[PDB]
Design a protein around this ligand. Structure first.
Ligand SMILES: C=CC[C@@H]1/C=C(\C)C[C@H](C)C[C@H](OC)[C@H]2O[C@@](O)(C(=O)C(=O)N3CCCC[C@H]3C(=O)O[C@H](/C(C)=C/[C@@H]3CC[C@@H](O)[C@H](OC)C3)[C@H](C)[C@@H](O)CC1=O)[C@H](C)C[C@@H]2OC
Ligand SMILES: [Ca+2]
Ligand SMILES: [Ca+2]
Ligand SMILES: [Ca+2]
Ligand SMILES: [Fe+3]
Ligand SMILES: [Zn+2]
Lengths: 117, 358, 122
């Protein structure tokens, strides 16, 4: 029951091109839907009808994303299971994320440095 | 405030209503519905006193109603709303104005949607105006547990106060559990129960309390039809609901056994989201009529499902489904988070990073 | 202490570049001297930290966070991740909930009473 990983695991739901992978410092465009372990949604870029953009692997986002997203190919639909340490830790992110929360992100990599899928 | 960047965007209503604005000019003992409709639409708030009055007056009426409501056609049956006030406005435009249309809501007025208290205050206001033509059933979300777990308690404490939340909780306990519409349909939120044999079982329930973790009162709010409803390999009636973590899944022979026992045509329910806003289940062998009807009245559920909503209209001997799409609504940060709490953690990081560069 | 910092001062794509450089410039001249350099850093050595966070949003340095200032500063960090409508709406609602004296603006007292629950170190 005890698994050994850095703090994030990826579940490939739908494959991308299998060629273009986000490298450290690249700008990615992702449609995400974040849920808790109970399955309840706390946030989604779909809610705003606006794909999320950020620089990956530079400490902009949580550690689970900086280590999870580069494992995805351009166009891939996957699910990221993120431990609290790769998430928001014991402090969490009130009033949105409780302390010591395992985060589950449905992520679709739409673009890598303005190269879309 | 004239000095805003995006002036084309309308600002929320700044002030709370006065007594003259609040009370109806035609009936000074009841709230102004047209005013409330517009005030809530513009994200306006009532005073604590006004909001408390609506809930308490609503409680006054609900406490006098039986556990099992009994109403005749015509009627418009509505499913889940879940704080989608701006879709609730579309609902009444499709179903018809409550002043000349008989309604029946199956529950789940709160949580998930960030305009739950607006839905409650307005629906309660309608109940005050039309106590004998508009009826409200209790959903599984109309309790202390789920409202505290999800967003409704947070919404009340944020937009108003804890006194408002406690008023709604008390009011939710007064909400009827079921209804028999036109002596043909059992109307509930969830589904059937192994303890539900006749309609008399519902009538003997003490509904003035929080829903139990198990039992008849629980199942009425939580039970679901099987995923393979109408196509069960076994002849079993019930089975543990692994999805909900409580109550049961009921089957087609289970539904038929109940309907034949109580001389009812169908079971009109909600509780489950449908892509078309509704789902018609397998027809009975006795009457050839759909044994179960799921009605869902929350379009584009959680702003992501992109589903249609629907209401059931039954008039004379005619019945039909009316669908409608979602309506744009103002944006809230998750859990009513303010932009200061929302941005400060990121600001602290960028300042810290800028410090290192020096 | 100050002698070491004075040595570092003599030796000397962030979205909050224009803002932070304007905070150090306390007279609004356009430059920054040692006294402005030390004073800016001294806040990171709980009240003074919150006072600095307030200056991030307060562009004209009038002591109040206006609706327009709040939108502009937020847009620097958010970018396209929120639509103009979506951001303007949560900006409007934040002001109303924080504007206890109803002047359309946000004082420092109103700001702290909003984020009493909530970060910057050296
Ligand atoms: C002026 C606005 C600020 C700016 C806000 C935006 C650009 C809007 C953008 C859609 C964020 C959402 O706003 C609606 C909202 O998304 C969440 O709901 C969410 O699903 C989430 O977890 N996401 C979002 C998707 C990427 C992963 C993760 C995240 O890494 O988000 C990042 C995050 C919070 C990192 C913190 C930073 C502080 C550190 O101390 C902490 O370290 C532990 C980690 C976000 C993107 C920051 O990089 C950028 C910002 O903060 C958060 C629960 C709270 C977050 O609002 C802040
Ligand atoms: Ca200067
Ligand atoms: Ca100002
Ligand atoms: Ca003020
Ligand atoms: Fe529901
Ligand atoms: Zn339900």
């Amino acid at each position: 029951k005890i698994e050994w990983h850095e703090g994030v695991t990826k579940e490939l739901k739908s494959p991308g091109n299998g060629v273009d992978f986000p490298k450290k410092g690249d700008f990615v465009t992702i449609h995400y839907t974040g849920r808790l372990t109970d399955g309840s949604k706390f946030d989604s870029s779909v809610d705003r009808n606006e794909p999320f953009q950020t620089q990956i692997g530079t400490g902009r986002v949580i550690k689970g994303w900086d280590e999870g997203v580069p494992q995805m190919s351009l166009g891939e639909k996957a699910v990221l299971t993120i431990t609290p340490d790769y998430g928001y830790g014991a402090r969490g992110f009130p009033p949105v994320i409780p302390g010591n929360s395992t985060l589950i992100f449905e992520v679709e990599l739409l673009g890598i440095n303005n190269k879309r899928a | 405030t004239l000095e805003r960047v995006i002036k084309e965007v309308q600002a929320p209503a700044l002030s709370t209503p006065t007594d003259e604005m609040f009370w109806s000019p035609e009936d000074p003992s009841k709230p102004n519905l047209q005013f409330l409709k517009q005030h809530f639409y513009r994200e306006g708030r009532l005073t604590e006193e006004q909001a408390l009055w609506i809930i308490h007056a609503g409680t006054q009426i609900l406490r006098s109603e039986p556990n099992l409501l009994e109403m005749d056609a015509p009627i418009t049956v509505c499913g889940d709303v879940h704080g989608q006030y701006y879709d609730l406005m579309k609902l009444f435009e499709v179903g018809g104005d409550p002043s000349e249309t008989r309604y029946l809501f199956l529950g789940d007025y709160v949580d998930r949607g960030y305009f739950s208290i607006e839905c409650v205050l307005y629906l309660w206001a309608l109940k005050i105006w039309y106590p004998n033509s508009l009826w409200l059933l209790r959903g599984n979300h109309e309790c202390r547990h789920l409202t505290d777990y999800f967003t409704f308690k947070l919404e009340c404490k944020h937009k108003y106060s804890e006194r408002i939340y406690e008023a709604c909780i008390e009011s939710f306990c007064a909400l009827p559990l079921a209804a028999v519409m036109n002596k043909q349909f059992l109307c509930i939120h969830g589904g059937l129960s192994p303890e539900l044999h006749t309609l008399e079982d519902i009538k003997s329930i003490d509904r003035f309390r929080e829903p139990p973790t198990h039992g008849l009162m629980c199942d009425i709010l939580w039970a679901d039809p099987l995923e393979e409803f109408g196509q069960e390999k076994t002849g079993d009636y019930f089975v543990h609901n692994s999805v909900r973590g409580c109550s049961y899944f009921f089957s087609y022979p289970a539904a038929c056994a109940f309907l034949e026992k109580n001389n009812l045509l169908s079971i009109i329910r909600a509780h489950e989201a449908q892509d078309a806003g509704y789902r018609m289940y397998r027809k009975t062998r006795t009457t050839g009529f759909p044994s179960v009807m799921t009605i869902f009245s929350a379009p584009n559920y959680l702003d992501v499902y992109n589903n249609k909503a629907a209401v059931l209209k039954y008039e004379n001997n005619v019945m039909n489904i009316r669908q409608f799409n979602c309506t744009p609504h103002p944006y809230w940060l998750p859990n009513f988070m303010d932009v200061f709490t929302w941005s400060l953690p990121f600001v602290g990081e960028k300042i810290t990073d800028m410090l290192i560069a020096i | 202490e100050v002698d070491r910092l004075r040595k570092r001062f003599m030796k000397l794509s962030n979205p909050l570049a224009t803002r932070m450089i304007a905070i150090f410039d306390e007279d609004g001249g356009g430059d920054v001297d040692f006294q402005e350099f030390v004073s800016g850093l001294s806040a990171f050595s709980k009240e003074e930290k919150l006072r600095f966070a307030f200056k991030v949003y307060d562009i004209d340095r009038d002591g109040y966070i206006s609706n327009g200032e709040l939108f502009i500063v937020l847009k620097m960090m958010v970018g396209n991740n929120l639509k103009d409508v979506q951001l303007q709406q949560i900006v409007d609602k934040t002001i109303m909930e924080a504007d206890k004296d109803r002047d359309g603006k946000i004082s420092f007292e109103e700001f702290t009473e909003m984020v009493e629950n909530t970060s910057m170190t050296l």
